[PDB]
Amino acid sequence: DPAGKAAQYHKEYALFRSANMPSPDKLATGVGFHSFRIPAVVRTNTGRILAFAEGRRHNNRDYGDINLVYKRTKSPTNNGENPTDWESLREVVGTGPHTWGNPTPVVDGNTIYLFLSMNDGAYSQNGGNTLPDGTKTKKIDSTWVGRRHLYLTTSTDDGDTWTKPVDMTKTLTPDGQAWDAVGPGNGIKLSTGELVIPAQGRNIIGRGPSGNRTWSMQILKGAGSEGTICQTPDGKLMRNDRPGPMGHRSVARGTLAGLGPFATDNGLPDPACQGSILSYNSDEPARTIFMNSASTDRRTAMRVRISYDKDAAKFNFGRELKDAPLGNVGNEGGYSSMTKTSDYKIGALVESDWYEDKGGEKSHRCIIWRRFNLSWIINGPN
Ligand SMILES: *[C@]1(C(=O)O)O[C@@H]([C@H](O)[C@H](O)CO)[C@H](O)[C@@H](O)[C@H]1F
Ligand code: NA
Numbered sequence: 001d002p003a004g005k006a007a008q009y010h011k012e013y014a015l016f017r018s019a020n021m022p023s024p025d026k027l028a029t030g031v032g033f034h035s036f037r038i039p040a041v042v043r044t045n046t047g048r049i050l051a052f053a054e055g056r057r058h059n060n061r062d063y064g065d066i067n068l069v070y071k072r073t074k075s076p077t078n079n080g081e082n083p084t085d086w087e088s089l090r091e092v093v094g095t096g097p098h099t100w101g102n103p104t105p106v107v108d109g110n111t112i113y114l115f116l117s118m119n120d121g122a123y124s125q126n127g128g129n130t131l132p133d134g135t136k137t138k139k140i141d142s143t144w145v146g147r148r149h150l151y152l153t154t155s156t157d158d159g160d161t162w163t164k165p166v167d168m169t170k171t172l173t174p175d176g177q178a179w180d181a182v183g184p185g186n187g188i189k190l191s192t193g194e195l196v197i198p199a200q201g202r203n204i205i206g207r208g209p210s211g212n213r214t215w216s217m218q219i220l221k222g223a224g225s226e227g228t229i230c231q232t233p234d235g236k237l238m239r240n241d242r243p244g245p246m247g248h249r250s251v252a253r254g255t256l257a258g259l260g261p262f263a264t265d266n267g268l269p270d271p272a273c274q275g276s277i278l279s280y281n282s283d284e285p286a287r288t289i290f291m292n293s294a295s296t297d298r299r300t301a302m303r304v305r306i307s308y309d310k311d312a313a314k315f316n317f318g319r320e321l322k323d324a325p326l327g328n329v330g331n332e333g334g335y336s337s338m339t340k341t342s343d344y345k346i347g348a349l350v351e352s353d354w355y356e357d358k359g360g361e362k363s364h365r366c367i368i369w370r371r372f373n374l375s376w377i378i379n380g381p382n
Pocket of ligand 1: 181
């Protein structure tokens with residue numbers, strides 16, 4: 001790989017700073033956040049980087065009052081190189097005591113589409129959970145009030161502002177469904193111009209001229225809840241999904257006409273956690289990048305890998321992110337998101353956990369921004 005001849009480059013720092021950290025991230029209203037989780041990142045066609053997360057207000061739990069927040073690079077050209085290259089925290093949507101999350105963006109010319117999941121603030125995936133006011137959540141169910149919804153917001157000004165989110169649940173989620181997820185992480189634009197967004201048990205497909213899309217569902221058999229999508233160099237689609245049981249990624253390949261069966265990929269261990277994937281380039285040699293916790297049982301084994309295969313069948317060992325560790329951010333590892341920057345770097349957001357209350361709801365969570373070049377990955381010790 002000719003990119004492996006270059007000098008290695010890596011740089012890393014916290015981008016979403018939890019309430020317990022110095023200079024914690026807050027909205028201009030003064031609203032701060034206990035934890036930030038569930039990253040999503042995209043480079044827009046200006047070169048500006050948009051980073052999204054769940055601002056989890058009161059604790060680290062996936063239910064409750066959670067606002068979908070973001071930051072942009074201050075200019076289209078700075079590539080998020082340094083902490084001061086980023087704007088202060090802003091909000092996409094935070095209405096009510098509800099959960100707004102699962103950011104799943106895709107860039108489509110001069111429009112950025114952002115899919116997201118939502119539930120009413122009184123409900124949680126398991127039910128029976130205690131909220132900050134002492135009330136107990138109901139279990140997410142199939143009722144309109146109690147189900148997980150799917151919303152869509154758009155920006156036509158390089159992420160400066162966002163439309164009022166549109167509830168698309170009635171057309172883009174199956175009738176009768178209770179729990180649901182979109183992404184989280186990102187969707188894609190195909191070489192043929194369609195948009196594909198990964199969701200629980202399905203793809204969401206956007207068709208039409210750039211910026212004037214209409215959306216349909218592609219229902220999948222055996223897909224996971226939290227999926228990733230990419231178009232591999234052969235032009236085919238691939239779903240690489242978080243498994244139900246801990247063990248390995250679950251993968252399927254196909255086209256807009258349908259995907260083949262999902263099967264466990266024994267080359268990609270995974271602890272039942274979200275991962276991310278990126279078509280880095282389609283020219284020779286074509287590269288697909290994959291990031292997850294490369295472990296059957298913990299989230300603290302983050303690994304970025306390259307595949308040169310036309311169908312991304314096999315990835316290399318790649319590189320452990322602990323080779324460029326960051327102090328003063330807790331224990332790095334968890335959900336992740338990747339984009340390619342204008343200056344030929346991979347930009348990755350990666351969750352980190354201060355772990356103060358161990359697995360408990362009071363442990364503060366923050367998000368790291370990493371940039372690295374192919375050389376950094378290629379020339380990893382292993
Ligand atoms: C995530 C996690 O940290 O494991 O889990 C998902 C969800 O609980 C699982 O996919 C099982 O359905 C949450 O939606 C996400 O916010 C995060 F917590
Ligand atoms: Na809110």
